[PDB]
Amino acid sequence: MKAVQYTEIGSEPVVVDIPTPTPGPGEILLKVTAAGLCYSDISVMDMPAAQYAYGLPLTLGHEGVGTVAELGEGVTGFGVGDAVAVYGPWGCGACHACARGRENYCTRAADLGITPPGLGSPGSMAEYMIVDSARHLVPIGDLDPVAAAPLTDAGLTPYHAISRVLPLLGPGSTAVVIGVGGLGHVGIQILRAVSAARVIAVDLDDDRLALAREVGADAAVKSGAGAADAIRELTGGQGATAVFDFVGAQSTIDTAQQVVAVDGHISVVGIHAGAHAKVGFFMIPFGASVVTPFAGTRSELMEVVALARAGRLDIHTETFTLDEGPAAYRRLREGSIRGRGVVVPT
Amino acid sequence: MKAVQYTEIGSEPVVVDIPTPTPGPGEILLKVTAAGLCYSDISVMDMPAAQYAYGLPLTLGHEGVGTVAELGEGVTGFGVGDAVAVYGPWGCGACHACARGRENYCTRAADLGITPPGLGSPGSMAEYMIVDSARHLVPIGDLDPVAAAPLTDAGLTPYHAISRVLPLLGPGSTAVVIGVGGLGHVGIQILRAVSAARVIAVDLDDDRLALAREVGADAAVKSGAGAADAIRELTGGQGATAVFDFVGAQSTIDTAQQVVAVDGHISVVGIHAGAHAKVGFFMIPFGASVVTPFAGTRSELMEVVALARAGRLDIHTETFTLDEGPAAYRRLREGSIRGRGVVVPT
Amino acid sequence: MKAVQYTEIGSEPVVVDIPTPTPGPGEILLKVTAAGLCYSDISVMDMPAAQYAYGLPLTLGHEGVGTVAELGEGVTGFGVGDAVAVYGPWGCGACHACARGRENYCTRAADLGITPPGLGSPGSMAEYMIVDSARHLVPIGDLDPVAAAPLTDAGLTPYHAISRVLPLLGPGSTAVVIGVGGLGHVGIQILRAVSAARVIAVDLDDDRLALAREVGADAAVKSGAGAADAIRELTGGQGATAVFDFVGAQSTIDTAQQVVAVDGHISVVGIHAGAHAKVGFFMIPFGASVVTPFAGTRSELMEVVALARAGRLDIHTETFTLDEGPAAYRRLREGSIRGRGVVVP
Amino acid sequence: MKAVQYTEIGSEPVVVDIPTPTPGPGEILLKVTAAGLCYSDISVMDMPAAQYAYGLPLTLGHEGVGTVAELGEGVTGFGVGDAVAVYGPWGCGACHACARGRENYCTRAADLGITPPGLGSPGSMAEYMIVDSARHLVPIGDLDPVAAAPLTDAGLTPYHAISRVLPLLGPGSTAVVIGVGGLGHVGIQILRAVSAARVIAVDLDDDRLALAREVGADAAVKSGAGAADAIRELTGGQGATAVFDFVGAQSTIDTAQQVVAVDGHISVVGIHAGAHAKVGFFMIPFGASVVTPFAGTRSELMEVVALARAGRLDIHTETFTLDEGPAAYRRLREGSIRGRGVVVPT
Ligand SMILES: NC(=O)c1ccc[n+]([C@@H]2O[C@H](COP(=O)([O-])OP(=O)(O)OC[C@H]3O[C@@H](n4cnc5c(N)ncnc54)[C@H](O)[C@@H]3O)[C@@H](O)[C@H]2O)c1
Ligand SMILES: NC(=O)c1ccc[n+]([C@@H]2O[C@H](COP(=O)([O-])OP(=O)(O)OC[C@H]3O[C@@H](n4cnc5c(N)ncnc54)[C@H](O)[C@@H]3O)[C@@H](O)[C@H]2O)c1
Ligand SMILES: NC(=O)c1ccc[n+]([C@@H]2O[C@H](COP(=O)([O-])OP(=O)(O)OC[C@H]3O[C@@H](n4cnc5c(N)ncnc54)[C@H](O)[C@@H]3O)[C@@H](O)[C@H]2O)c1
Ligand SMILES: NC(=O)c1ccc[n+]([C@@H]2O[C@H](COP(=O)([O-])OP(=O)(O)OC[C@H]3O[C@@H](n4cnc5c(N)ncnc54)[C@H](O)[C@@H]3O)[C@@H](O)[C@H]2O)c1
Ligand SMILES: C[C@@H](CCC(=O)O)C(=O)O
Ligand SMILES: C[C@@H](CCC(=O)O)C(=O)O
Ligand SMILES: C[C@@H](CCC(=O)O)C(=O)O
Ligand SMILES: [Zn+2]
Ligand SMILES: [Zn+2]
Ligand SMILES: [Zn+2]
Ligand SMILES: [Zn+2]
Ligand SMILES: [Zn+2]
Ligand SMILES: [Zn+2]
Ligand SMILES: [Zn+2]
Ligand SMILES: [Zn+2]
């Protein structure tokens, strides 16, 4: 087998029966124990035919954890039964970025026909999944799979975004988190674990602001036209050292530019087509850098797993069966999952 | 004493006779040996009455070198006759940024009424000038004052911009320099001295491309619509690790976005009101950060001076008298100074 | 004031009456609200006549907080009544290190005759004290002075030592803290606040191990011959990413070398004359760097103050009067102050 | 095939005929084009029987370049004929260090029985060699193999040592290089290429001081009792920002401690059993860190190759045949190779 696939442009994903794959040389077959739903899946399924490039059908799910079921020829660095998380943004493994584990920034992958699981290659929303190479597996030991699956993107992506500017986030700093969803609720917790920043969370929804306080935000601010003034009141007029925008709409990016401090940072993490920061003199403070980060690195995924194993990340989830996969995507689309949706096969 | 002042909104600067100042407690009086002209002075003098905030009259010149003439009460660490460069972007000296020498990013200066020489306080285009505090002087020893004056902004600003991302500029990297004027011709030389980056220079003017090659650029490319494709051809389709845009027009920022590499950097250094980078998904590569840097730090100015003393910077200048100051500004406006204009008071 | 001074080589410090100073141009007079005792004061007072270089008499105390009492001529940026901490390791203010606020690493100060309060210039163990320049004052707002005074060295020094290698201390890292005294008990708390490192504390004294657990250590291990094996058991045989040795005896440095990981770090912070790490092939792991850090930077002191104001540092103190100053030093010498001794004028 | 092997404890290496190997799955067979001699080979061959752990016989050579001769089953990313350099310090590929390319600091390799070529596995001093995995090959394009072979250790090791502290080596800094041999003569050139440090070279031999000046040292100091005072005279009494000791004898480490600046660095790179820095209060300046670095990282090797391709490294070599291999080791032992000895098979 059972899997959840995107099969027709503009249609909802469907539950299918397809062959259980067998690993070729160097590949590993996992029995999937948990598969996370990411809002990027919604954006992908909303692409018109002219833009959509991942092929049909596509087994969804780029947040995957499992146990090693079968080793392909020549694979010996894992044993059958090992609990592993899948490193998602597969790169070529050979370029200068990849040599540093920064496969998220590989520029050679596309030309070599290397695509990530759930985003061009078959994903984790299935009873079993293939992983191309052992370097794309990270051990998780006895971590609960349901809470582990989101670490692979909801954890990894905020972790990487924060890591890019961690030296800015010393005692006395303030970090703003915009969007307390799958990514944002983990982002707050990463900030608390790896920095002494004061954390201000921003969301449209009072229940998400409650979630933010539950996971350790120091303050919670309603998003929209009043947010910039409210944040500036909290920061004593100086603004926020860093803003991590997990929404990335034009309104939230505007809020971010209106509150960022001199020599601070805006990380535009959320993906809303057309929205952008306007980085120019008189439009942003001196020295305030802006970036659109993507995914994270191999060693960053290991660090996220280490945070989880140390008890520093309380991942808020709701569990679904494979048969409930399409229903779960409807819930994600409408904004009614408090945290991360996770499919648990069987 | 003789000085060059901006005295009337919309009018050319004029040569004046005003009193030689006397240093109060903590201040230092310099006999000016060289005063650099910066294109920012043109932009300032082009501001309409409603925007112009630096007061009239204003003695111009924020690139200053001199010899210590008189010590104000309680000043130590300098003797009469010492050759010094003036650190330009005065801050409060007390905040967290200033404590690190990063007075360029002080947020307290404005509210305390602290303004820089030539940009709210009296500048260096005069026989003598006041410096507010000893911490705003850096010794230059026997460096030629004419070539030293530009170090204080034409050197400092590119040096800071490059320093923000120096770890990116390893062997195999490429740095693009857009605009081979006062700042840009120094920026090329800094890149060559402190990194192993391949340097590609870009300018509208073929004589400035020649200047770029003279000061060590590896390649020089005509600016305009064909520049992005030409740069991409030189970088093997991978793009440039970093782009230092010393023009900052919309067209040059667009060129920068079209050539920057994944996980690279654009530094928008030149100031053209309204121009901005558009930093959003699908509009810039993943991981490519963008910033508008401002001036530089105390320790950075010392490092620039150290480069000059080591013979690493060939500063291209043309010398003017104080009486020629207004004529020199006309030359700067029309683009006919090959490098930096420098006034030498007699 | 009344002051406590070291007055005679080899003798205990004494309570004295000396003139209240007046600030000259650029100086600030503080009314002292709290003055910390540091174990370095013991080491200084144990120096023989041939080594001791700070002059007699010396008003002790290089951990100082106060309120601005008088401004010297030309001083700006502070008002009378402002609560401030004194930045201790005064530098020249002009060199490349000082320009970055790294006055702790100034090499010009000695030749210019610049000495720190309590260590060549008059210290904070007195009703009033002089500060040379406004850049050596950091505002503390409404922070309790008793808990604030130790921030200026018990806080600053561990903070700097940790900061030198903070990028190593990611999730999955382990930091060992040897010596849970004035410095060490703050070091544990800094590690918890600014990193995700697992913290293993080491001390001779079971009550100090309890203190370590109270302030957030993940494990606390008895020092001595068994400590290295115990630490290696806790780290799965891989050793510790960083070791912060706040004792710095040969035995503790040896423990540090026996537990540090490949590509890790040993910070020798505690001062024991003659003791040293042996950094050579076959004697330490590949890539494991070793340093003796000193004090900290201007911006680091500001950051320490920010941690305290945010409630991230529970500074364990015992309070003494000026008259009790000599008794407090005897207590420090014998090891009976649980945390930091602080004199309140 | 012909090879040079260490075959008997305490005896000179010998030229042998042994079978040409065949690559198994994931392995690559190279036709060797150049094999560097490293002084570590001398130290290894001087180990008594009780210490020597690399097995007999051992094909020597841990500096290897070649062309791809045969691909083992499942190998991708290289074609037959590709010119490649061998990354020497093989790690497990999977741990946190290896995920960052830092296989030089892998702690899992020993327990997994992973040993480097020339140092437990068969080396490059042979007509052909096996490489275990594609990730241990770096393309060199048309670089001359003779000058390329030393990049793999004589280049890599100094490059890594310098890289650990590159942010210290700003304009105005001084770097001391002790020992102008295989590693040291490359170290000087790396410092000149990637920093603005003033470079002071130190050697016992006047001809090696001449070599140092030939490759870009600013100053040259005779090693021994007068070296520390001479270096301090050159640095104005302040001492050297960093000392890279490629000898690592007690006398050179003592020199390094006597000249290092406050908040500087000593890198003990050369290996002399028993010698060590004494890092304690009153024995070294405040803030001066000391480390024994080992080899370098995957991305560092790529950077070294990039320096060579850009013309930044003039590698001084002497060429030997395989039959001359033992004679070349005698020359290395006696100190008569001016730079790096390189064996060029058939
Ligand atoms: N850059 C990357 O590599 C990367 C990786 C993964 C996901 N993403 C993107 O991150 C974004 C978030 O993904 P998710 O799975 O956490 O989404 P989610 O649907 O789980 O959460 C969205 C959250 O944002 C809040 N929100 C929406 N509009 C808002 C506004 N105007 N102001 C404040 N809050 C607002 C919602 O109320 C909700 O709490 C998506 O755009 C996704 O595509 C990016
Ligand atoms: N960010 C800061 O802190 C800071 C500090 C100093 C100066 N500036 C700004 O930097 C800019 C440069 O100042 P300068 O004094 O070196 O100027 P300048 O007049 O000396 O040099 C301008 C150069 O840019 C070239 N140029 C102009 N338009 C171009 C285009 N479209 N493409 C390529 N080249 C082009 C010119 O031919 C000339 O060589 C100005 O905008 C100035 O205000 C900024
Ligand atoms: N590097 C610097 O700039 C700097 C600055 C300030 C203080 N110091 C030094 O730091 C050291 C500590 O100062 P303090 O004021 O915190 O001392 P303290 O007397 O308050 O505490 C000492 C602690 O170390 C423990 N201890 C002693 N020997 C031990 C051993 N062998 N193993 C484990 N634990 C042991 C004690 O039980 C006690 O808890 C002193 O040497 C002091 O001079 C250094
Ligand atoms: N740390 C590592 O990862 C690593 C890697 C490779 C090599 N090494 C070691 O680096 C060292 C250098 O190797 P190499 O192949 O360049 O050696 P080499 O024999 O080619 O060069 C030695 C050089 O050091 C000089 N020298 C010797 N004694 C000296 C002294 N007392 N003072 C000043 N100069 C002196 C010689 O005159 C010669 O120029 C060796 O100990 C080697 O084992 C270490
Ligand atoms: C479609 C989207 C996927 C991001 C993700 O991995 O969540 C992207 O490629 O930008
Ligand atoms: C007025 C202008 C001055 C920049 C400069 O210092 O050259 C600015 O601050 O934007
Ligand atoms: C013998 C030495 C080898 C270093 C090298 O690779 O040159 C070591 O591993 O200790
Ligand atoms: Zn996703
Ligand atoms: Zn790649
Ligand atoms: Zn300017
Ligand atoms: Zn300031
Ligand atoms: Zn102390
Ligand atoms: Zn100084
Ligand atoms: Zn070697
Ligand atoms: Zn490994």
Instruction: Inform me whether the C-beta atom of residue B234 falls under 8 Å from chain D C-beta atoms.
Output: no
CB contact under 8 A, B196 and D171: no
Boundaries of every domain in chain D: 1-157+295-346, 158-294
Q: Which fold has domain A1-157+295-346?
A: Quinone Oxidoreductase; Chain A, domain 1 (3.90.180)
Q: CATH topology for C1-157+295-345?
A: Quinone Oxidoreductase; Chain A, domain 1 (3.90.180)
User: Closest Cα partner for A33 from A144, A139, A157?
Assistant: A144
Determine whether the shortest distance from the Cβ of D40 to ligand 7 is under 6 A: yes
Tell me if D312 and B195 make a contact (CB, 8 A cut-off).
no
Q: What span, in angstroms and rounded, lies between the C-alpha atoms of A27 and B2?
A: 80
Alpha helix segments (H runs only) across C112-175? 145-148, 156-163
D101 inside 8 A of chain A by CB: yes
- Antiparallel, parallel or unpaired: β B174-178 and B198-203: parallel
Q: How far is B74 from chain C (nearest CA, A)?
A: 7
Domains D1-157+295-346 and D158-294 share a fold: no
**Which amino acid type is present at position B28?**
I
Q: Which of A6, A42, A44 to mutate to test the pocket of ligand 5 (most atoms within 8 A of CB)?
A: A44
DSSP annotation of C126: B
Q: Which residues, in sequence order, are CB contacts of B188 under 8 Å at separation 6+?
A: B177, B180, B199, B201, B212, B215, B216, B217
Task: Report whether the peptide linkage leading into residue D57 is cis, meaning its omega lies within 30 degrees of zero.
Answer: yes
d(CA C13, CA B14): 68
Distance (angstroms) between ligand 14 centre and the Cα of D179 equals: 15
Q: Angle CA(B184)–CA(B189)–CA(B190) in degrees, nearest 5?
A: 90
Residue A88 CB partners (closer than 8 Å, separation 6+): A62, A63, A64, A116, A117, A118, A152, A153, A156, A295
Q: Please choose, from the candidates C344, C167, A327, C291, the residue with its C-alpha nearest in 3D space to the C-alpha of residue D265.
A: C291
Interface contact flag, D271 C287, Cβ < 8 Å: no
Both tokens of B208, joined, read: 């400035």
- Judge whether C199 and C217 are in contact, CB under 8 Å: yes
A156 lines ligand 5 (CB under 6 A): no
Q: Calculate the alpha carbon distances from B343 to B11, B87, D25, D115 in Å.
A: 20, 18, 72, 66
Q: Structure solved using which method?
A: X-ray
Residues of chain A in contact with residue C166, where contact means CB-CB under 8 angstroms, are 167
D265 touches chain A (CB under 8 A): no
Residue A191: its H or E element: helix A182-194
- What residues have CB less than 8 Å from D161, skipping those under 6 apart? D187, D244, D267, D269, D293
Give the count of beta carbons closer than 10 Å to the beta carbon of residue C70. 16
Task: List helix spans (H) across chain B.
Answer: 39-45, 96-99, 145-148, 156-163, 182-194, 206-214, 227-234, 250-259, 298-309, 325-334
B-chain residues within 8 Å CB-CB of A273?
A: 281-282
Element (H, E) at B261: strand B260-268
Q: Do B150 and B63 contact (CB within 8 A), yes or no?
A: yes
Give the span between the Cα atoms of D13 and D330, in whole angstroms.
Answer: 10
Interface of A with D in 325-344 (CB under 8 A): none
Measure B50 CA to ligand 2 centroid, in angstroms. 24
Distance CA A65, CA A315 (A): 14
Under an 8 A CB cutoff, do D193 and B198 touch? no
Tell me which ligand sits closest to the C-alpha of residue B253. Answer: 2
Q: Is D170 on the interface with B (CB under 8 A)?
A: yes
Q: What is the CATH number of domain D158-294?
A: 3.40.50.720
Task: Please identify which residue in the block is written with the tokens 């584990």.
Answer: A101
Q: How far apart are the first and last CA of chain C?
A: 10
Structure tokens given for B90? 């005065």
| Distance, CA of C205 to CA of C339 (rounded, Å) | 13
Instruction: Using DSSP, state whether A290 is helix, strand or coil.
Output: strand
Ligand 13 centre distance from Cα of residue C94 (Å): 5
DSSP state of C254: H
Q: Is the CB of B105 under 6 A from ligand 2?
A: no
Query: How many angstroms separate the Cα of A227 from the Cα of each of A68, A210, A243, A282?
Result: 47, 17, 13, 21
Structure letter (DSSP) for residue A44 = H
Whether residue B254 has its Cβ less than 6 Å from ligand 2: no
Q: Is the Cβ pair C198, A304 closer than 8 Å?
A: no
Is residue A38 in contact with ligand 5, taking CB distance under 6 Å?
yes
